[PDB]
Amino acid sequence: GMTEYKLVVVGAGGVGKSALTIQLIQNHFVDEYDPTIEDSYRKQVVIDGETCLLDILDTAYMRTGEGFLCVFAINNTKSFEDIHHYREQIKRVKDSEDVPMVLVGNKCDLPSRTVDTKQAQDLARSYGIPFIETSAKTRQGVDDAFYTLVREIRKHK
Ligand SMILES: Nc1nc2c(ncn2[C@@H]2O[C@H](COP(=O)(O)OP(=O)(O)O)[C@@H](O)[C@H]2O)c(=O)[nH]1
Ligand SMILES: [Mg+2]
């Protein structure tokens, strides 16, 4: 059969969890999206030549997660400061120190960057995970983030 990957998008309010998901799925940038709406979105894609099904859960099911995107916004220091909370949450619900994960720095199209690449890279390295810069507005890195996570899930086992 065709492979299915259950992915989960986590992070502080306003970082672009919904916008990133809707970019991946509907291929357009949502300028506003109810912050309390939590829902799952499905899409068939090809990644590195392999066809598969994605099941993205956009948080505002959690235990069934095979891979997690931890999102902060590069113009939102508070959202970056909060990442550890989500990291630790995931390790608790999965009851494991080994969970496929990607750190995502979103809104890289904006000029008022307060979290530099160095900081993000160092944080990611301390977790042993990749760091991907993204923009839900421009589509920069959007595929890369979600695909990298699938490659991490494939690399997981
Ligand atoms: N400029 C810019 N704005 C973004 C980006 N991603 C999300 N936003 C905006 O940030 C706000 C909150 O985004 P949203 O997806 O609802 O964040 P969420 O609470 O994490 O789900 C909205 O006004 C979005 O249009 C981005 O990459 N660039
Ligand atoms: Mg949202």
Side-chain angles (χ1 to χ4, degrees), residues 1-49 51-60 62-96 98-156:
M2 193 176 293
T3 315
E4 165 169 0
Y5 303 105
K6 298 181 182 300
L7 310 180
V8 184
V9 183
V10 304
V15 301
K17 297 185 297 301
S18 295
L20 281 171
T21 303
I22 298 296
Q23 260 295 359
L24 183 77
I25 306 302
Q26 294 191 328
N27 289 337
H28 59 80
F29 177 59
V30 71
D31 55 6
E32 83 184 307
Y33 196 93
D34 189 334
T36 73
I37 288 180
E38 175 165 311
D39 209 87
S40 62
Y41 308 80
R42 307 172 121 151
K43 183 183 183 188
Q44 176 173 310
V45 295
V46 306
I47 304 171
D48 305 328
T51 305
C52 58
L53 305 186
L54 303 180
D55 183 29
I56 317 299
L57 185 82
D58 172 30
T59 69
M62 181 66 183
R63 335 198 194 110
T64 71
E66 307 176 45
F68 295 79
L69 292 178
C70 300
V71 189
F72 71 96
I74 56 95
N75 70 329
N76 189 336
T77 301
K78 188 167 200 306
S79 73
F80 177 71
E81 290 167 346
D82 288 340
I83 286 293
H84 73 282
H85 177 59
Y86 299 102
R87 168 73 171 173
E88 298 153 26
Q89 273 182 203
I90 295 163
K91 300 319 223 187
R92 273 191 287 275
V93 66
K94 299 304 297 296
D95 198 351
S96 171
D98 194 318
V99 182
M101 262 182 48
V102 179
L103 183 67
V104 180
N106 191 41
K107 311 197 180 184
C108 288
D109 52 288
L110 297 174
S112 43
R113 170 176 286 243
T114 51
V115 190
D116 58 45
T117 312
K118 169 84 131 55
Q119 284 172 296
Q121 285 177 353
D122 286 349
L123 178 58
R125 287 161 176 174
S126 71
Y127 290 155
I129 62 181
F131 166 66
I132 304 296
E133 292 194 21
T134 65
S135 175
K137 188 172 182 291
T138 71
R139 301 217 66 222
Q140 166 177 351
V142 176
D143 285 318
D144 200 357
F146 285 100
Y147 290 8
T148 295
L149 183 57
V150 171
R151 295 183 190 101
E152 287 291 317
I153 290 169
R154 290 171 172 174
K155 169 168 168 289
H156 184 21

